[PDB]
Amino acid sequence: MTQFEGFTNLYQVSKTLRFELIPQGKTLKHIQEQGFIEEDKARNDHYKELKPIIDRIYKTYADQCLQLVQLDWENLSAAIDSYRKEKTEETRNALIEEQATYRNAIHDYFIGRTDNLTDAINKRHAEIYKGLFKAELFNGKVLKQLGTVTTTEHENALLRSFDKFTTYFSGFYENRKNVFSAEDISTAIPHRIVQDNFPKFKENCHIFTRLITAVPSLREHFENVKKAIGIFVSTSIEEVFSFPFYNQLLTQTQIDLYNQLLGGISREAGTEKIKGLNEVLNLAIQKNDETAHIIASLPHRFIPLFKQILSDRNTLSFILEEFKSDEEVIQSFCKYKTLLRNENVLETAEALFNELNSIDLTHIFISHKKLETISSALCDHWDTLRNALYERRISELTGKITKSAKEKVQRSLKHEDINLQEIISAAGKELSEAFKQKTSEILSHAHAALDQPLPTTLKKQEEKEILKSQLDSLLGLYHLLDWFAVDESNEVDPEFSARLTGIKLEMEPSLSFYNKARNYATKKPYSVEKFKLNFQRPTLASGWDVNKEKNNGAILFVKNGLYYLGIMPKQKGRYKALSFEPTEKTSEGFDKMYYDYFPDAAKMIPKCSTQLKAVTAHFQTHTTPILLSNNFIEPLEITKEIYDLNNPEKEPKKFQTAYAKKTGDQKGYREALCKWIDFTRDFLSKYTKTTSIDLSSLRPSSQYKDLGEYYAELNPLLYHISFQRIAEKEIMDAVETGKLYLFQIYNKDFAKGHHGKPNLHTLYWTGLFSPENLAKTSIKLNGQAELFYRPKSRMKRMAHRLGEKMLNKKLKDQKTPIPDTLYQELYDYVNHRLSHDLSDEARALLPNVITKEVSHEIIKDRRFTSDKFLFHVPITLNYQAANSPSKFNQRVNAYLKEHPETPIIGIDRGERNLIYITVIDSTGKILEQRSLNTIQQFDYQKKLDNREKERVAARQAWSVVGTIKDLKQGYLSQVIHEIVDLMIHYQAVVVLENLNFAEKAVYQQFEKMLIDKLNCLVLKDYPAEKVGGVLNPYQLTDQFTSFAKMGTQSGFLFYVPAPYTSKIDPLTGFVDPFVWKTIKNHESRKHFLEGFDFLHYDVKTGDFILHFKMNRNLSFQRGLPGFMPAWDIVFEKNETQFDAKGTPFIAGKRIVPVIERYRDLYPANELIALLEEKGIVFRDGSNILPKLLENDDSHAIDTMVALIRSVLQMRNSNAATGEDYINSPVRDLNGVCFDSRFQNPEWPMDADANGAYHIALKGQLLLNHLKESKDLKLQNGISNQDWLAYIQELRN
Amino acid sequence: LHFKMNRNLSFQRGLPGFMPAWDIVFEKNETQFDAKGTPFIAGKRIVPVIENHRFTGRYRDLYPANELIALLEEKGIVFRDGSNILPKLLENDDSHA
RNA sequence: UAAUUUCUACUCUUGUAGAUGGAAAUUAGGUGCGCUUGGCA
DNA sequence: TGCCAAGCGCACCTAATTTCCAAAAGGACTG
DNA sequence: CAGTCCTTTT
Ligand SMILES: [Cl-]
Ligand code: NA
């Protein structure tokens, strides 16, 4: 049978380790003498200047190709339409095929293999493309064929700075292939054109069509917008939304024009913005007329296109020019301030506002657009002023006050500019005072700011704050002046209008200044960055192989449990390359690694045999075999059969499984497969690097199903590591003469005083060089290691000064933390600087604190107070396995069917908890449940919330923002740790919400980290040879590829829909079945009431019972009949009950919305109240519902229905009280209503816990349905109805 | 101490009155003289003496302005510049302060 | 209120516990501020 | 205590997805 | 050239 310990060595996992390098002997001196750090820093800067210049080549060529593109998009449109309407696998595969067709068509323009062009252009293109990813960039040929464009001397100086060193760009080359690729990859121009933007552009066409059909008036409105924007003059609005035009939307310039048709164009701040289509639509919806509803019911928002890869963005909107220095902003603003002084704006403004005290307030108007801003400023609420205006006008109407008249008044207030006399009359003299007070403040602060002198730089935050407040004050005055409606439509006092407009014009630059100052001041300062080291070796540390040591300059050593990196630089003088001679292992010295690798057979074999030039040149005009002798102890035969096998016309090769899919030649497949493997074995037997490799463990060629299976077994044999001893003399002299740079590879696990557990990464590294691993490779050392230099980034400041005492964050408990609010007090107290008497709570903790005097000076941020050499080195684990797994989920599912006792860990994002776990057994009973707001005695939820608020505050205060991703990782690392221990201890499935069905970041980040961890899980404590140790990692999730490609299962991890997991009774499965949106009138509520069979009082219990059949009130339901035909809904007597800990609560309590804040509500009590007010007999046990209905009192009906809705509100929250409970309105089989307030640990302790519990239980649904299934295939999602039916049947 | 009346409404008795804002003043604790000629200390308050928890038999003379000067100088806050003190008082969340 | 390849939390311990896939390229989005036209009874 | 919709501009922070993780063939230099 | 060492490849 299967076993949990059988989840290992299923696929390769690559990782990077990071270390510090400590130079030894005269290494640092030689590095300094040779001036390598400066040289490598200079390369880095040259790379950064050059990259944009070189990028100009790609950007131009790409646009030149994309301007010529003319495709027909109908077929792709159709495939999209098929797969959308019918959701099958065959329609998908058709779209995937079509997608790939369209991509290749776009790509054909780049490579010069498109029929839509002439032979001359296709010849020119292929010629350019042939040189885009080589050093042909740096020669000028590709720029010679592209235009008569040319480069400035400085640009040529840069290009020649990478002479004999163009390989520094060999990664860049890959990044740029990723732009021009035809593959289905995000980085690529074709993908962007085909799978990103075209769907959008298609959808836009559809939206346009449907809109102008429903509402043909829009056609011209849209055309008019285009006229007003001044783009696409020769193209009518119809053509813009036709497929052929999409051929004109492949270049950035045109995409931005398209986007601004949707988007509109802003001018200077304060001026009217030109509206685009999407705004015109929004405006039309917000009118709430008939045209609005028609539009609101359709799709009413065009989708902007994504940008073209690499291309610079353009905008027709106004861009404000930047300040360049502290000095420039201070001068400008200082001048503007002086202008405002000499102009006499504050004294005019004050005189203007005074004018208001004794002038006809009928001839002063307030802008309709500002009425609500003024309300907030001068009144309790934003609607105060409107409402007072409304109510006053209503009171002034003549005749019987119809509803239409009130309607008319409301409509008048939307547009009309209101005079100040009316505003005052409606709101009261209070308003006059609030106005005068506010104008005083704004003038007072403005005056203060003009008098207050400016700082000398903006280098300190205190200085930026001086700048900010002065701008704030001036902006305040600008805002105040902009309160007044000044236009000549209203009968404004002529003087007032002229004077206001005058000082408004003088104040207008405040806007411009405010924005520019912010845009400058909130810039982040150049922080120092580590840069790559090369030591004058273009292929430095590219790969470790003995045969490459003389080119790549990097070797490894071991000596007395310590690890060293050997770098062999190219010095400035003439020196013979350094050679190392082994000796007897007894002699003192360093053990040097001899690394022996033949990379991926699949590529290297053809590279060294079939794909040779001489081979290709021979088979071009010959059919006779060719025998290779060079690097072969005996000659290797290349026959035409073999050559043509790896070099076909046909798209799939005859030995790839794709030829088996495409055709039906299983004979010829396996025959081609055998002959190729045979040939590989012939190569391996003869080639110099492989001939001595024992391949007897390989099987006979004929027994391999796929080529991958073969290469999977082969590659593990083609890598070996051994050590030989070099004498101390050779090494020390090499260091002495500067022919060797020797560094200790270091982390804190190598400290003299290290005496604890090592970092996981240390364990990987030591496991890598362990004897077991050398004999049978589990961990491989990979090439492409990198060395970095990181300059000091902080100043040395010891966290101490003299005889300071340091206060442990935890008590002698070594468990209980000191409150955040008390720490500084206790800290200042134990260092005798409190400045006041100690608080009572501090004085209570005082006896259990721990202090440590400072004997040894430890440096804050020490690691960053001096330059460091860093080293990144990649490794691969589970090396014996294939590179990707096969049918990983099936293997888990197989294991699960044979292990029905498997427990489930539900994980939930909560409302009051970041993450909440509930572990269930295989019978759906809770083993454990807890919030993970606190781990290791630290409240991460509080720390995170505080840091998020700081970051907002920073943003608003033009202060340094900083990062929160580090704190998030800190937290999630602890969480991941605890989930991993639970999984291992329980051998359990883990179940999370699918987020496709706020604080969704912290949970998304979790998902990622959890999977990455479970892809390769090593537990420090476990021995190396035990499953879960370093040489046998656990692999419990499927190999992560992308979130895009992720399904509802990744091994032991499962995703389930969140709906109906929190607001659901744990004992019955009951959910509120009603849609309260559809209960809105006296009519709807009364039909709703008529649907219930009875409501009657039970004198025994004190409860009311309301009987409902699920087949009634369908109009008001969500179409989820679940499993139960009826429910007795219960109004619980509002009596005292006691929880497990002995704390009381009131049964049946609800917490309902107020929005003042929430209100306590006792339904049963309130029902009795209603019935007693109405005088309706109920204590006999009679049906109350006919009597409420026959009476036909609408307020009694409303109340009753309001009460029903409350009773059905299971979840009841109040942050203030910390209540967040579930109380079910229905009795379980044993005749009791669930209440989390009882604090029974068998059940959910709160609402968030209930969530996790049902997350877990949805997983259980998947495991139960898997068992019953005869496949190893998990069902695709869970419909809400299936869920409810499941859980309701189970519980009852 | 400036208070807008359309503010901190959670602690108000719901009696806005007529005025929008008040400049609450901590009067300097200097000597003033009544008409008869008797001296008194301006700004003086008479507050119950409180023993731990809730115990109040006798009363005591308090001088708010001077005690504020004490509290600021304790914590090294500069105030004779005319600068706003409120942000500085709650910038570090000192419970005593 | 300190030590780290680096991060978070710690300090019996000149260090502890857990985590940690790098580099390069690209793209998408978020938060904040400013502004525009509108909406809310 | 006022938010919300559609959108334009600026600052910076965060996340997702691609390539590589190489010895040796190939050939541009450089006396 | 013949060798060296950066460039490019499967
Ligand atoms: Cl829910
Ligand atoms: Na450790």
From Swiss-Prot, chain A:
A molecular function (GO) term: lyase activity
Q: Does the keyword Magnesium apply?
A: yes
**Record region (RuvC-III):** 1248-1292
Q: Segment WED-III (OBD-III): which positions?
A: 719-884
Q: Which residues form a coiled coil?
A: 74-106
* Ranges for region WED-II (OBD-I): 527-598
What does the UniProt entry list as the effect of changing R1211A?
A: Nearly complete loss of guided indel formation; nickase cleaves only the non-target DNA strand in vitro
Biotechnological relevance of this protein: This class of CRISPR enzymes recognize a 5' T-rich protospacer adjacent motif (PAM, TTTN for this specific enzyme), unlike Cas9 enzymes which recognize 3' G-rich PAMs, thus this enzyme increases the possibilites for genome editing. When appropriately expressed in a human cell line mediates human genome editing via indel formation; its T-rich PAM sequence may make it useful for engineering of AT-rich genomes or of regions such as scaffold-matrix attachment areas. It has also been engineered to recognize altered PAM sequences, which will enlarge its target scope.
Annotated region Bridge helix: the residues are 941-957
What residues does the record give for site: Binds target DNA?
Answer: Q1005
Which residue stretches belong to region RuvC-II? 958-1057
> Which cofactor names does the annotation list?
Mg(2+)
Positions of crRNA binding = 47-51, 175-176, 307-310, 752-761, 806-808
Effect upon mutating D908P = Complete loss of guided indel formation; neither DNA strand is cleaved in vitro
Q: What, per the annotation, is the impact of changing R955A?
A: Partial loss of guided indel formation
The observed outcome of changing K780A is:
Nearly complete loss of guided indel formation
For the region RuvC-I, give the residue spans. 885-940
Q: What is the effect of changing T167A?
A: Wild-type to slightly improved guided indel formation
What functional role does this protein have? Answer: CRISPR (clustered regularly interspaced short palindromic repeat), is an adaptive immune system that provides protection against mobile genetic elements (viruses, transposable elements and conjugative plasmids). CRISPR clusters contain sequences complementary to antecedent mobile elements and target invading nucleic acids. CRISPR clusters are transcribed and processed into CRISPR RNA (crRNA).
Q: How does the entry describe the domains?
A: Has a bilobed structure, with the REC lobe (residues 35-526) connected to the NUC lobe (residues 1-35 and 526-1307) by a discontinuous wedge domain. The crRNA-target DNA heteroduplex is bound in the channel between the 2 lobes. One nuclease site is found in the discontinuous RuvC domain which probably cuts target DNA strand in the crRNA-DNA heteroduplex (residues 884-940, 957-1066 and 1262-1307), the other in the NUC domain and probably cuts the non-target DNA strand outside the heteroduplex (residues 1067-1261). Target DNA binding induces domain movement.
Q: Which family does it belong to?
A: Belongs to the CRISPR-associated endonuclease Cas12a family.
Q: What is this protein called?
A: CRISPR-associated endonuclease Cas12a
UniProt organism field: Acidaminococcus sp. (strain BV3L6)
**What taxonomic lineage is listed for the species of origin?**
Bacteria, Bacillati, Bacillota, Negativicutes, Acidaminococcales
Q: Which gene encodes it?
A: cas12a
Swiss-Prot record, chain B:
In biotech or industrial settings, the protein's use is given as: This class of CRISPR enzymes recognize a 5' T-rich protospacer adjacent motif (PAM, TTTN for this specific enzyme), unlike Cas9 enzymes which recognize 3' G-rich PAMs, thus this enzyme increases the possibilites for genome editing. When appropriately expressed in a human cell line mediates human genome editing via indel formation; its T-rich PAM sequence may make it useful for engineering of AT-rich genomes or of regions such as scaffold-matrix attachment areas. It has also been engineered to recognize altered PAM sequences, which will enlarge its target scope.
Q: This protein's superkingdom?
A: Bacteria
* Free-text comment about domains: Has a bilobed structure, with the REC lobe (residues 35-526) connected to the NUC lobe (residues 1-35 and 526-1307) by a discontinuous wedge domain. The crRNA-target DNA heteroduplex is bound in the channel between the 2 lobes. One nuclease site is found in the discontinuous RuvC domain which probably cuts target DNA strand in the crRNA-DNA heteroduplex (residues 884-940, 957-1066 and 1262-1307), the other in the NUC domain and probably cuts the non-target DNA strand outside the heteroduplex (residues 1067-1261). Target DNA binding induces domain movement.
- Purpose of the protein: CRISPR (clustered regularly interspaced short palindromic repeat), is an adaptive immune system that provides protection against mobile genetic elements (viruses, transposable elements and conjugative plasmids). CRISPR clusters contain sequences complementary to antecedent mobile elements and target invading nucleic acids. CRISPR clusters are transcribed and processed into CRISPR RNA (crRNA).
Q: What else is known?
A: Part of a type V-A CRISPR-Cas system.
- Assembly behavior: Monomer.
Family as reported in the entry's similarity comment: Belongs to the CRISPR-associated endonuclease Cas12a family.
The protein's name is CRISPR-associated endonuclease Cas12a
